[PDB]
Amino acid sequence: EFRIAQDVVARENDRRASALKEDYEALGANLARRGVDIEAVTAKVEKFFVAVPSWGVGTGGTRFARFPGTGEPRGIFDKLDDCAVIQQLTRATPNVSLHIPWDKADPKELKARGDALGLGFDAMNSNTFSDAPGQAHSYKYGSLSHTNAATRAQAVEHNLECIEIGKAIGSKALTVWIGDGSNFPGQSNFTRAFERYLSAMAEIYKGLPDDWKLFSEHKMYEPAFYSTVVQDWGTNYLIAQTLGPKAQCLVDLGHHAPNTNIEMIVARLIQFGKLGGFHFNDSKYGDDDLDAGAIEPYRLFLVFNELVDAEARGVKGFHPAHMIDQAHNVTDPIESLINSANEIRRAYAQALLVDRAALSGYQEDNDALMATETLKRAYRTDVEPILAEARRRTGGAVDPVATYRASGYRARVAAERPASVAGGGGII
Amino acid sequence: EFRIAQDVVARENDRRASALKEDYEALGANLARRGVDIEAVTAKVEKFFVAVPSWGVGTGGTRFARFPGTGEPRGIFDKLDDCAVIQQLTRATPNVSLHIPWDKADPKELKARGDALGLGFDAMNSNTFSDAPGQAHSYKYGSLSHTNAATRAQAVEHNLECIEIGKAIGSKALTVWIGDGSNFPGQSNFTRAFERYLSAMAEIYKGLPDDWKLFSEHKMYEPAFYSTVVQDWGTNYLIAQTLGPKAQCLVDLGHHAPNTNIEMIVARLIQFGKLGGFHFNDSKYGDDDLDAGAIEPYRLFLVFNELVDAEARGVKGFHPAHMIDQAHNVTDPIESLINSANEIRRAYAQALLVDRAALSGYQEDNDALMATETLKRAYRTDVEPILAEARRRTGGAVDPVATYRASGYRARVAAERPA
Amino acid sequence: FRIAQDVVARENDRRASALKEDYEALGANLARRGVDIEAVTAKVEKFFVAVPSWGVGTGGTRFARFPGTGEPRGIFDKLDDCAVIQQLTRATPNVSLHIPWDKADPKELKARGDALGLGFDAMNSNTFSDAPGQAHSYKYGSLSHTNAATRAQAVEHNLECIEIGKAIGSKALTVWIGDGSNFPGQSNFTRAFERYLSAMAEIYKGLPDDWKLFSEHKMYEPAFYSTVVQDWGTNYLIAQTLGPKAQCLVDLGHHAPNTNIEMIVARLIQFGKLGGFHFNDSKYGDDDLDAGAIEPYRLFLVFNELVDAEARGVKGFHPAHMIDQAHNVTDPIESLINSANEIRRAYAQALLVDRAALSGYQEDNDALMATETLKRAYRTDVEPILAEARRRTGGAVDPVATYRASGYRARVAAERPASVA
Amino acid sequence: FRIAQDVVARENDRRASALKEDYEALGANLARRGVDIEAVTAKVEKFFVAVPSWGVGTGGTRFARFPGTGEPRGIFDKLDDCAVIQQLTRATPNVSLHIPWDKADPKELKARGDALGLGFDAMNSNTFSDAPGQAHSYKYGSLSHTNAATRAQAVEHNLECIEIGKAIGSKALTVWIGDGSNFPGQSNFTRAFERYLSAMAEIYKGLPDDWKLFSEHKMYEPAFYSTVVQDWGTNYLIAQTLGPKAQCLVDLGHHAPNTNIEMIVARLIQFGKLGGFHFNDSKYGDDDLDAGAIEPYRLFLVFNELVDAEARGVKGFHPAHMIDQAHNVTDPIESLINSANEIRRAYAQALLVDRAALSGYQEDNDALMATETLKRAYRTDVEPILAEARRRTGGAVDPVATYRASGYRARVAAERPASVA
Ligand SMILES: C[C@H](O)[C@H](O)[C@@H](O)[C@@H](O)C=O
Ligand SMILES: C[C@H](O)[C@H](O)[C@@H](O)[C@@H](O)C=O
Ligand SMILES: C[C@H](O)[C@H](O)[C@@H](O)[C@@H](O)C=O
Ligand SMILES: C[C@H](O)[C@H](O)[C@@H](O)[C@@H](O)C=O
Ligand SMILES: [Mn+2]
């Protein structure tokens, strides 16, 4: 199937082919003068993939309000149809990340739809940070770390079910992010809550297939506003080290305290073999969940610099799961995910241009200026031509968003799906 | 009428009266040794009021979920009923802040219910940060500063309607907080957006009664995650100054950048006569909206220290509007508001204890250690006895939350209200 | 006696009546709450915190230093001044030394301490500044420097610190370094940390059987882009890697904005790697201000975690307590006195928490009453308890007022020549 | 010429070929985008930023200072090194002086500047440290000190800075003071500000008709609790109160974590009080790192506001641009060279933004395309433009490469005695 007509894609590509050939050739000549083979770079970029969040193709909101657009997806099936568009145009998001119970449905159908749309399934995501209809025990005061045994058992069961769904659809990991924490000093005993959490996670670990991974995701705050059980990478490391070989840490960019050196955390986790994966997005204030690289592109580049460095030195058993975790409140969710996936490949491609030998030399000589300039030479490079050519050669669009708007997809699905209504957030 | 049975109040007060007498007399003797008449302090404390937010009486939530408790208020009237309890027990929250359209209802009935419950109404709160049913233009991309004139006009009209409702119930002010801002660089032109906002606010100011005040509330971020039109007190000052004498700035404690010295902002606004009022709450990370003083009680004291100093310096015509703006996500909203109102009176009382003459002397002599110790001598003082006696003398409860739970009020409204 | 005993007695007697009234009033109030004030006073009078030799002299910033009068000339003057703090507060019996700043004949240092009634806490190494005759500069690092010879030099300095500490009665070595980078790319994060670990392993080998090696994390300064030992996570990795004798030291002002520090303390305790504390306060960065002068509640919450550990029955839990502050606009002696007092204050209030009631509220998820239970302790003015603890142990009811009445500062100002160049 | 002309020419010819290729390639791409590269280049070669005299020497922190070789001592050595930056970049024709650090016979300074081809930007007063023989200490403040005589002394000092500046070609005085408090209660926020305003009014009276008075806000350091001129809000009140000749100076690293600085820039421009900038980068506090070395996009976004201000033809808009950095681990000259380069880079890129398209996407609320319009400009590698601009104006294609090829550092190292061999 092709959510976007092939003629429109070919049409929009031909319209930009000339300019692209020029830019690509100019960049290739420049890279050559730098001892770099543009073709080698493009080949790797075509092979870089990042999972899209099923809950990301829908318009998001804040605790104050939600302003849905037209053609909002009704459920997992409409969401998969929209994710297909993203993959077809960018060719960078072949896999979708499911969230339960939001995307609960017959595993056979999900798999079927995915195969038909040319989409796979990444890590499963459990939900014990909200109450579902008919739920026996509320997660108001926590889940996996709740003081009530029955409540923890219920949370554990839910996570085990997520693993069962994932196995049936082709997933190989479970990501566990909970809101568990406290809003007031004294409300929670830090140590006892963590102990409860560890014990519950141990039960979940027991249900992991031999080739599966369990990712725990830390977050400084929100929904808890005083303390959070899994508040940072330090606690997260203790979790992973304690649970076992299959347990690793997931780093969501906007989940750190102000001014935190996030790329260092990535490096530390790689060093001790616990970098399970990433949740890409950008931010300026808190866990803003904005389009990747829209606020601080250099920081995104620096994270990838650590990723490529580890890749370069053959760090064996190094396959971090890459996923986008964003909320789109003022843009067409599909266009944002498209450009976000693009930005990620942009940062990856620039990281690949880093002269590793020269950098190592300046590091050993303590030539700070040249070391930092060596990274900038790669970062300053406009690799858009490589990103565009990679898409073109793999069946994607030179200009993804332009082709998307030219296709009229949004207007189309807007006519097929029921209207939505604005409203307030959880504030009241 | 009394939401809490008068016999329960008398009972729970008698049960703690002996202990209170002992603590009050001990504190009075200690203060007397420090040259302070405890009676003068209690007299002032029982006169300190802070308005309760109608939107804080029901359980709050986040973008991730809402976990309502039992007996949740069904509307503004249930909310007023619950606010009546807060006032009856603490005697520090005689006024309620309404939010339109959330609390829209016959103004005449609101006033009636208010008078019967012994409650009054503080500043009105406009809402152009969310869309209402049948709304012609969406506020998705802004409201008062939206690029579309028709949208801006609609936002202006809404605020004017808020003023009409407030005039009917006895409100004397309009508080304007909007989410207007951008999530991406370039999305908005900082200056043009601000110019649009100023022009729209000028229209609202034009329709403001001459016995009313117009409060603009700054916020660093959320719902906007890259830029916000009214992002800080600097922009807020420019707004108030531009609009006119009736326009002032409202300071919400959790709306500042990390590590910001908020008590200084308060002092600066007072000096330039633009401190319209406060939205009290506490926080640790962002605009957490937690129970006031639950996280950083000293900071609360330091804010009140600037308020009391303003009086001591002789600043005139200074009557800030005091209001609580909190979200109660994991506690009984009534209990949180009760203890929050209490914490605010606590900080106020301690600020009244500061030996101003001594402090002044240490400041002039640059004796930093004794100057800070002078503030600490006041802050370290446990004024709970003064707060409890104040409540007792004015019809409240020695221990509000204890009396509240003894009343079984929550179970009662839980039975009267749906699930 | 640094401070004349008649001065202390006179000042104590002047305030005796008021202390009696306040203490007995507090005692009755606590009794009504089921707490024995005498039991609290008995524990308070035994809570000690080490005073930093480097904080007895006036501090400064990169912009300027404004010395006061009678600045101590060397380590001996500093010990003399520390003796004043201990005599008046009775809460600072031990001094933390810094090498090479306080380098001197161990026997002389020991003798002076004994004569003044002072002991010595953990030693502190210095490889964040260059000393004269140094073969290699620490400009680009020390224990993690790319140059092997530079690292070896840093290792030998730490071993020397241990030798000095052993001779004077110390039982630990605290290691804080500025190692890090100011530009992206300057350092390879993983290799720099590996170099550090290798060097610390060597230092670890020189530790006596009853010693401890404390590593201190810091988010930034002097490094402004990355720091090798940047946070508690990296710190935990260090202690766990080095061995049983290695633990983490938590300096309150070394964390990112809004960090929940008390949780970090709880985590380290759970995994037995909480070596000790560097107490101070701050509002912006590593401000190094007088403990509790900015956020007294936070200080109380850290102690709440320390007391809960004891309540939970954590075994062999003896964290080292030290003050690490810089006094740029006050008399250092007066600030250290009141800071030590704030520390005992927070400790005393933490002892007042009704743990039985708290555990009940935590189990029932009664967040409001749980927090109020903490507040009922924190709101209690324990000054009378601190004052009585001092009176009973030979200290001053009001330390700073007594210090000022003694005229000590004016005395040492006349005895000590201020530096000219 | 500090750098031999044959060296400059040689290093240029070595890179001339590749540059021609890149400049032509960028010119074609820009043409396809409706942009004339020549128009950009013409503006870029005219963009200047003043170099801080206190920036050519190696910097340090409160913990240590690690000087490099050939450290410039005195204003004459410093002007000599600044000349190198100007010769190679052609973007720093003016130097910012700091009194009393750079005190010297005005006529001799003017003479040295003209000989080196350097002018002088805003004068910088210093009342955040004490000079020998000073009558009153600034320990507790200067312009806002509680002591009248101390304020008068500070005021007189600034006036002297204006006299020195008038004699050498300066047209502005920048005032940054450390004035503030480290403890709650220490200062009365309002009285301190009142005193500051009164003193600044006296300085303002000494300003010639064509002079400007810049006040610089700073959140913290040296004051760690409160600072009189803590932010742009207070700064605006100052400028508005003093008069038309008074404006606000924005130092990028003086803001609270996560602050939207470009918005502050826009607000000040709207109200005619954006006096100038102090460029530098940072990640934690006022790190004073090489401009754009940490967050180059933020720098671009600041220049986006600057370029748009001109595009709108705002009145009273003519900001002074200065670099205010500290180089603790690099050759100061090289850092200043590359920092000045980054500033021009951001400027060039902001010049590339399609204002018409941007304005269109803003009106339609097409946030995605709006931000992409900024990115299209930002993602554009303008190095070819910067290099050509330098080549056409007598500068070096690759400034740092040419600097190293000249062996200048080793040269001054042989002429200037270090403290130790
Ligand atoms: C929906 C998803 O579980 C969620 O975004 C988490 O991954 C975490 O980012 C929350 O802050
Ligand atoms: C509900 C109320 O309008 C709201 O809380 C505003 O005042 C502001 O605090 C929001 O962040
Ligand atoms: C002097 C002492 O080594 C130093 O203060 C360290 O302990 C650490 O606090 C530095 O920021
Ligand atoms: C040296 C110069 O006066 C100084 O850097 C000020 O401009 C300010 O940036 C300090 O933090
Ligand atoms: Mn996530």
Ligand SMILES: [Mn+2]
């Ligand atoms: Mn998140």
Ligand SMILES: [Mn+2]
């Ligand atoms: Mn508010």
Ligand SMILES: [Mn+2]
């Ligand atoms: Mn708010």
Ligand SMILES: [Mn+2]
């Ligand atoms: Mn320390």
Ligand SMILES: [Mn+2]
């Ligand atoms: Mn420190």
Ligand SMILES: [Mn+2]
């Ligand atoms: Mn500056």
Ligand SMILES: [Mn+2]
């Ligand atoms: Mn600065």
